[PDB]
Structure formats: structure tokens, C-alpha cells
């Protein structure tokens, strides 16, 4: 318990069903065709349908939702923009030139030796980086007046075709010469060497010695594409390009230089960025002298133990629901079975392992079966038992759980199993509902994304994935009507503001979602 528990205007029980989306199409629809008399009634009259995929939850458009993203958005009361979406917005709205860390890196160059490097994967793969991001970096750096800019081009061939490198090379050459008239290519080397993540420091060292010492094949802007073509004819493709060296010593990473890695995916940046700025050049086992007084910046955070500034550092996620309730001295209860336990803790609480004052947790063991189609009810009955225990106790003004079966049994593709999982879930929801009415709680039912409403593809094949359908938001309290946001569809970011309103509690400024009920 906690001091302000009774100050609440309504106690609230929040059920997050996993993989339960709203489809009116009945073909392969495990929810519709299951016996679901409880959700049939809760999803009628005054209920809402809210978005849980795509840009509504901070993911690229057209991308299905998932448990990690959905629980994060529900618990956070705000859209958390995924790196790709975030940086692409910055690029389109010309926001690199005002980016705090970038201005800081250019200021460092301008106040120092004038020299700045860009390094990263040059292609349109979109997994680790995007060439468009690098171009926007060059344009902004030019406008910020940095004297001297060098690029270190890492060849892809893995997220793009093995012989696409020469085209991105041509683009980059032409862009630097004709579009910016500013910036110079200094290095070309394959990701095999530059972007190892398996502690193969003999691979890293190839890239490192090219950047630091110019160890590789000499060329220039007139010749480098031809050099690459010859490597292709020799059967050495983008991923495996051995170093090509441009601009001579001018283009090496030298004493006092500044460097920006522009990849947004951290795993393949940690080795080379630590060789440059985290005192791990020793593992490269090079005979070259390591430059002194380097400063490294990353596009995103590569490791929290690194001293590097990030152009797009993590969302801090201050005052997600779990934190805000403890701040208001209100206790809370989070319950899931094993398969979704992280989702009601780590992810619901903001994507980090932090448990707040007054927060109680309960884990219900998932059944020990080979696949969950073999026990489609999983442990839903047990989660409901623990929630009913809490409702009868009345201790916690906010309680929430996850029900695993529709998502986890849906991933098996077994339609009749998915039906049984939706029936087990509905039964458990009905038992929680009856306990809430007997002990003075309002019930809200939602989901983190869809899944079990589409168990068959059009060709009748099994559909084992999440979906882009809307999810429910229900509310048993009769003193409220569901209303839409002014400017957009409702989405998961609105669940927590609505709970707080119903609870009579304040909304923190960091929750930029909105309550979607009116009193």
C-alpha cells in the first residue's frame, strides 16, 4: 500500500490481452468464432477501438504491432518513436542543423583543428543506417561551417545486393562534388571488417588501420569505382571490400580529430567505435600509433558505458504510469504468466529494468508443454485467480495483467487451438469482471496488438503473425463516454491518460497522449 491510495476517485483494473485485435471479417477469426460472451458484451455500447501498429505506436507505417512496442506505449502514455521513424522525421523537417549533439561536434571541430569524420554503412538497406541520413549529415555540417569533412564508406552487400556498392559509391561521389561541393571520400572498406560484432578484432583492425594509417589500396575520385568493379570481377563484393584509400594522410583519422558514426543500429558499431574512443584499439593489435584526443559521437547510443554523445539519445521516459503512480503515492500490481512477464514489467515500465515504490509483481508459471497449441488455455486461469485475489483485497488502486494465450497460441498457426485460447481468455476476463463489480473497481480491457483475429491467409494458409488491426478499449464505469482525439485516431499512448482521468489523478506533462473519455 501507499499513503494516497484512498484519495483515488475510482480504482481501476486494466487487462491487456495479448494478440486480440478487432476484425469484422470472420474468415479465420479465432476471436469472433470462439465463444466470447464476455467481450461481446464489454465491446458494445460505450467502448473504443484504438491503434496499436505503424506510426500510431512510433513504428514505420504499415508495420504490425508487437508485444514489446505495445506494452511500452500502453505503460508510457506517449508515442515512443522508433529510431528509423525518429531520424527520418528529423531529416524531412531539416532538424539535423539544430540537433544539439551535431552542433556540439561541429563546434568542437570549429574550435579545434577543423577536422570532422563521418563513418558508417553506405546503402539504402535501412537495417543499420541509411545513405539519406549521411547526406543530411553532410548538408547540415556544411551549413554549420565545419572546415574539413571526410567520409568513411562501409560496404554493405548484406542488407542490399552484393554489387550495389558501386552505385551508392557513384551517388556519394557525385553528391559530394556536385550537390554539396563540400566533403571528401577518404575510405572504402567492407562491413565484414568494419562492422564485426563477434569480437573478431583481426577483422576490425583492417578497417581501423585503413582509417588511422591508410593501409589499403590507393585511389582517388576518378578511379575508385573502377577499383571496385575490378574487385567484383575478382569475386570480392561489397561486404568484403578490402580497404581503398583516398585523399592520402589528409583523410586519415588524426590527432584531435572528431568523428561521427551515423549507423543507428548499435550492435555492429560497438567494436569500431570502441577502438576509436573507448580505449579498445589495443585489441586490434596494430603496430600503428593510435591518434590522441579523439572525440566520438554516435547516431544513437551504442553502449551506456561509452562516453560518446548521441545525435538521437534514448527517450528518457520520465513518468510512465508505473513511475507516476509511485510519485503520487499510489500502489499498484502487475501480473503476467512467464511468456509475457517481461512485458508487464521491463516494457510496461518504460523499456528498462526498474520497479517503483509500491509496485507489486506476480509471475504465474506458463505450462511446460512443447508448443502452446497443446495447452491453449496456457495459464490464464492462474493470472485471473491472482487478479481476483487482489480485487478482493482492495489494497491496490491500480492493478493490471496480461493474458498470453491469443498471441502465443496464434503464433502456432493452429486455428482450433487459437479458438480455445480465446475462449479461455474470455472466461478469465468474465471472472475478473465479476470480481470488479463486487469490490468497487472499474474494468478496462485492451490489447497490445492483434493476432488471433486473423489465423488464415486469403489462400487459407496459416497466419502466424501479428496484425495492423485496431484493438479494444473497454470501460465498465457508466459515468464516461469514449471520445476521439481532435487531430488523430486514438492509440495505445492514450490508455494511460485515460486510466489517470478515470482514477481522478493528474496527468504528467511527459504523457503526451490524451485521455479519450469524457465525464
Amino acid at each position: 500500500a501507499m499513503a494516497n491510495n484512498s484519495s483515488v476517485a475510482n480504482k481501476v483494473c486494466l487487462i491487456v490481452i495479448d494478440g486480440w485485435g478487432v476484425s469484422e471479417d470472420p474468415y479465420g477469426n479465432a476471436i469472433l468464432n470462439a465463444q466470447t460472451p464476455v467481450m461481446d458484451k464489454l465491446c458494445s455500447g460505450n467502448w473504443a477501438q484504438i491503434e496499436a501498429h505503424g506510426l500510431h505506436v512510433g513504428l514505420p507505417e504499415g508495420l504490425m504491432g508487437n508485444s514489446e512496442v505495445g506494452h511500452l506505449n500502453i505503460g508510457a502514455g506517449r508515442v515512443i518513436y522508433q529510431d528509423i521513424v525518429r531520424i527520418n522525421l528529423a531529416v524531412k523537417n531539416n532538424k539535423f542543423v539544430t540537433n544539439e549533439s551535431l552542433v556540439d561536434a561541429c563546434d568542437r571541430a570549429k574550435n579545434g583543428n577543423g577536422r570532422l569524420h563521418l563513418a558508417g554503412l553506405v546503402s539504402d538497406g535501412g537495417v543499420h543506417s541509411h545513405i539519406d541520413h549521411m547526406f543530411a549529415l553532410v548538408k547540415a555540417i556544411k551549413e554549420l561551417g565545419v572546415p574539413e569533412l571526410y567520409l568513411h564508406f562501409y560496404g554493405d552487400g548484406r542488407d542490399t545486393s552484393p554489387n550495389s556498392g558501386v552505385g551508392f559509391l557513384e551517388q556519394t561521389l557525385e553528391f559530394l562534388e556536385k550537390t554539396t561541393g563540400y566533403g571528401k571520400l577518404a575510405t572504402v572498406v567492407g562491413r565484414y571488417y568494419a562492422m564485426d560484432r563477434d569480437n573478431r578484432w583481426e577483422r576490425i583492425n583492417v578497417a581501423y588501420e585503413a582509417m588511422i594509417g591508410g593501409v589499403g589500396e590507393t585511389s582517388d575520385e576518378a578511379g575508385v569505382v573502377e577499383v571496385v568493379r575490378k574487385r567484383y570481377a575478382a569475386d570480392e563484393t561489397d561486404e568484403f571490400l578490402k580497404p581503398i584509400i583516398l585523399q592520402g594522410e589528409k583523410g586519415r583519422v588524426q590527432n584531435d580529430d572528431t568523428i561521427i558514426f551515423f549507423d543507428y543500429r548499435a550492435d555492429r558499431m560497438r567494436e569500431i567505435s570502441a577502438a576509436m574512443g573507448m580505449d579498445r584499439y589495443k585489441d586490434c593489435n596494430s603496430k600503428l600509433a593510435h591518434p590522441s584526443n579523439l572525440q566520438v559521437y554516435g547516431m544513437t547510443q551504442y553502449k551506456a558505458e561509452f562516453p560518446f554523445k548521441s545525435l538521437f539519445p534514448p527517450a528518457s521516459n520520465k513518468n510512465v504510469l508505473a513511475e507516476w503512480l509511485a510519485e503520487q503515492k499510489v500502489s499498484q500490481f502487475h501480473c503476467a504468466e512467464t511468456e509475457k512477464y517481461a512485458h508487464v514489467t521491463f516494457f510496461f515500465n518504460g523499456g528498462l529494468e526498474k520497479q517503483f515504490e509500491g509496485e507489486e509483481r506476480c509471475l504465474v508459471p506458463s505450462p511446460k508443454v512443447a508448443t502452446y497449441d497443446l495447452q491453449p488455455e496456457m495459464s490464464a486461469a492462474g493470472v485471473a485467480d491472482k487478479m481476483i485475489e487482489q480485487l478482493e483485497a482492495g489494497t491496490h488502486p491500480f492493478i493490471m495483467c496480461n493474458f498470453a494465450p491469443p498471441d502465443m497460441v496464434g503464433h502456432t498457426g493452429v486455428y482450433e487451438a487459437a479458438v480455445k485460447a480465446c475462449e479461455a481468455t474470455d472466461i478469465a476476463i468474465g471472472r475478473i469482471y465479476e470480481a470488479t463489480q463486487k469490490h468497487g473497481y472499474s474494468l478496462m480491457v485492451t490489447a497490445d496488438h492483434g493476432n488471433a483475429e486473423k489465423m488464415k491467409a486469403p489462400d487459407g494458409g496459416k497466419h502466424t503473425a501479428h496484425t495492423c488491426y485496431r484493438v479494444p478499449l473497454t470501460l465498465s464505469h457508466p459515468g464516461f463516454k469514449f471520445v476521439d482525439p481532435a487531430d488523430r485516431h486514438p492509440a495505445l499512448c492514450d490508455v494511460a491518460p485515460t486510466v489517470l482521468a478515470i482514477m481522478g489523478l493528474p496527468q504528467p506533462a511527459e504523457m503526451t497522449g490524451v485521455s479519450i473519455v469524457q465525464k
Binding site: N66, Q82, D83, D267, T300, P314, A315, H411
Partner: peptide, 14 residues
């Protein structure tokens, strides 16, 4: 998994 919105959130576990 290291920070909210990082690459692992694109598709998640499942």
C-alpha cells in the same frame, strides 16, 4: 533491448 525505440523494437520477440 538496450533502449526504448532501438532496433529490437521493430519486430520484438514475436
Amino acid at each position: 533491448x538496450d533502449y526504448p525505440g532501438d532496433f529490437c523494437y521493430l519486430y520484438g520477440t514475436c
